[PDB]
Homo-oligomer: 92 residues x 3
């Protein structure tokens, strides 16, 4: 997946970024755990998009709501990642 | 640009899928008020930024799981049309996952406000 | 309080299903409660106890979802041959990450305290 490599790039960098910076181990945890939290969901979204694909040829509101909600869940986690990182980096 | 157009389309799928989660389910609105209040509550109450995050990240996280549950109940509904007999365990376990996050949020908030207050 | 409370019964009957119907779920399940108790027995910063637990619980919340995914595949892949067998595999992948996070969290957090 090219977008998974696009987000995959986003995640590993952010992890590495949190590591070069000297910061409280607690905050390093929060930075990494926040970005990692995004990584777990995207995979689950990848997991959902996999099942939805297995059954059904046509469009549905029952089918596409699942993908759209799946795409929605990923979005929120990234906001958290953005917000978490913002509030945490605001102090420094 | 054509690498950044892929990202705005995901935002559109997210928005149309969030409002889908929002409108189609009444139970999703009950956590949202709890979450927005608790987030705003966590924002106006003065505490160290790490603790705000932990308060917010617990509260925001409960909301995140519920979205996945809405995604599962959507999938189970799809099989509700192709198949005839549903097992319901997926919905039942999905409902179980949501609970745990709230426990965490409560516990997170309990332990966090106890420490400071 | 009755409109939503049926879900709490749905949680229990769906959890007692998760506990009993799946045997492998108990190996991490035993591990988390231990990890929680351990995190509680250690005298530590309240924030870190949260972080230890919030890290360990995060594994737990996700794993139930894998049980939820593995359930859907079972109704479908009951008599059919799936090319999309990966959905279970992606589910197992998310859990691994959570445990990695937990390990790293506990690794990095316990390094700090000691």
């Amino acid at each position: 997946e090219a977008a998974f490599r696009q987000e995959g790039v986003a995640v590993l960098l952010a992890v590495v970024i949190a590591c070069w910076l000297d910061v409280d181990a607690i905050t390093r945890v929060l930075l990494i755990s926040s970005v990692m939290l995004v990584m777990i969901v995207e995979i689950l979204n990848s997991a959902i998009e996999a099942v939805v694909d297995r059954i059904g040829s046509e469009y549905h509101e029952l089918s596409g709501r699942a993908k759209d909600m799946g795409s929605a869940a990923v979005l929120i986690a990234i906001i958290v990642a953005v917000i978490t990182w913002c509030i945490l980096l605001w102090s420094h």
